[PDB]
From Swiss-Prot:
Main location: cytoplasm
Protein name: Small ribosomal subunit protein uS11
Family assignment from sequence similarity: Belongs to the universal ribosomal protein uS11 family.
Modified residues (Phosphoserine): S1, S124
SUPFAM superfamilies in the cross-refs: Translational machinery components
Gene Ontology cellular-component terms listed: cytoplasm; nucleolus; small ribosomal subunit
Highest rank taxon of the organism: Eukaryota
Ribosomal protein keyword on record: yes
Length: 135
RNA sequence: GUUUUCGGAACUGAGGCCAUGAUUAAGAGGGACGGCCGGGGGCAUUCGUAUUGCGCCGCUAGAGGUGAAAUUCUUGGACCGG
């Protein structure tokens, strides 16, 4: 819990992987390599109902938690990496995607580079669901 | 008896002559040739993320899924990140 960098000199960076599906939200702050994580709180560990694990509010107080946890450990700036469910499944981020990084911005954390890292397949396997779709 | 001119039948050589004999080249067709063209076909080769699984590392208690849930996965470490 000791960041040897001087604060007013410059900023200590981290990176949070925002994974917003349509059934849950993930806020995963890791180091610049990603091999070593700092905090990871989901939207489902903040609300006592499955149906709103991905609600934008459930991600708003899941990002205020990780930002509070990412503060004293010594990180001030964050690179953002949005990610939808990807693969052959959906490509647009879920509802709790925007209310997440807006919360941690309002929580006093600096922002670096923002990027979509959705796992876009070159040419997918057969997507789940019949030929006639989800009728 | 015979040979022929004699009329007929057949063959065989040299001619002479013909205005000496081949319509056109289909906004029909075939074929050739020319430079191209094309997710045409075949065989071989190469690349791409993704998905699933496994190994290791990190941190963790939920993760999945739905109209809402449950079956299912999970401190024997799932999901998430490398």
């Amino acid at each position: 819990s000791l960041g040897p960098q001087v604060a007013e000199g410059e900023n200590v960076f981290g990176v949070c992987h925002i994974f917003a599906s349509f059934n849950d939200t993930f806020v995963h702050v890791t180091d610049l390599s990603g091999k070593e994580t700092i905090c990871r709180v989901t939207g489902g560990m903040k609300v006592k109902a499955d149906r709103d694990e991905s609600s934008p509010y459930a991600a708003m107080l899941a990002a205020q938690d990780v930002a509070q946890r990412c503060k004293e450990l010594g990180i001030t700036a964050l690179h953002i990496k949005l990610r939808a469910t990807g693969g052959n499944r959906t490509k647009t981020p879920g509802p709790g995607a925007q209310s997440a990084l807006r919360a941690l911005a309002r929580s006093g954390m600096k922002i670096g580079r923002i990027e979509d890292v959705t796992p876009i397949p070159s040419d997918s396997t057969r997507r789940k669901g019949g030929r006639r779709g989800r009728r």
